[PDB]
Amino acid sequence: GFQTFEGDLKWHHHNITYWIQNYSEDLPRAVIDDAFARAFALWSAVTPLTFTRVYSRDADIVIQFGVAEHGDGYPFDGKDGLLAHAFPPGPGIQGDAHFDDDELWSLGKGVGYSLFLVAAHEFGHALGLDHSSVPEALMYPMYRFTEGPPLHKDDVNGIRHLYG
């Protein structure tokens, strides 16, 4: 089924704030903003956590686009392979989600990886959700373009376990 992190990592307050560090030129500013807002929105319904967009570094979740070597000492691999990573809830790097810009970012439709869709799985990690044995889950290691809506019992059971 589903998994959580050692020690059951979670945000210990209910207002979660995200600051978007930068953008890909792949998408217009507005599409990217929307794609992310939607990804929290899927998580918003099922959790006590609310997500407010902020314009400060002090934010709980910081989203950035990086190529190869970037901030956290974890390098991306270029085209394909790794597309994004995230860290379980906590201070600094924890709760933060990074997307590899070498990847083509789109709303999918066979043109690339859906920014919303990659974001949800990273956002799931950001809330403390680990990977799932269930092959239909959002937290599954395998990405496919939507047979969505994205959310699943396994993923939702996973989130209910941690927060509500």
Interface with Zn ion: number of residues (CB under 5 A): 2
Q: Is 147 among the catalytic positions?
A: no
Strand partners, 99: 65, 84
| Minimum CB distance to Zn ion smaller for 14 or for 67 | 67
35: CB partners within 8 A, 6+ apart:
27, 107, 114, 115, 116, 119
- Does 8 contact Ca ion by CB under 5 A? no
- Does 33 contact Zn ion by CB under 5 A? no
- Contact pick of 66, 88, 95, 150 for Ca ion (by CB under 5 A): 95
CA-based angle 54:57:62, to the nearest 5?
A: 75
| Minimum CB distance to Zn ion smaller for 15 or for 74 | 74
Q: Considering CB distances under 5 to 8 angstroms, the limit depending on partner class, which of Ca ion, Zn ion, none binds residue 135? A: none
| Strand, helix or coil for residue 32 | helix
Bond preceding residue 149 cis, omega within 30 of 0: yes
Catalytic machinery residues: 122
The site for Ca ion (CB under 5 A) is made up of: 76-77, 81-82, 95-96, 100
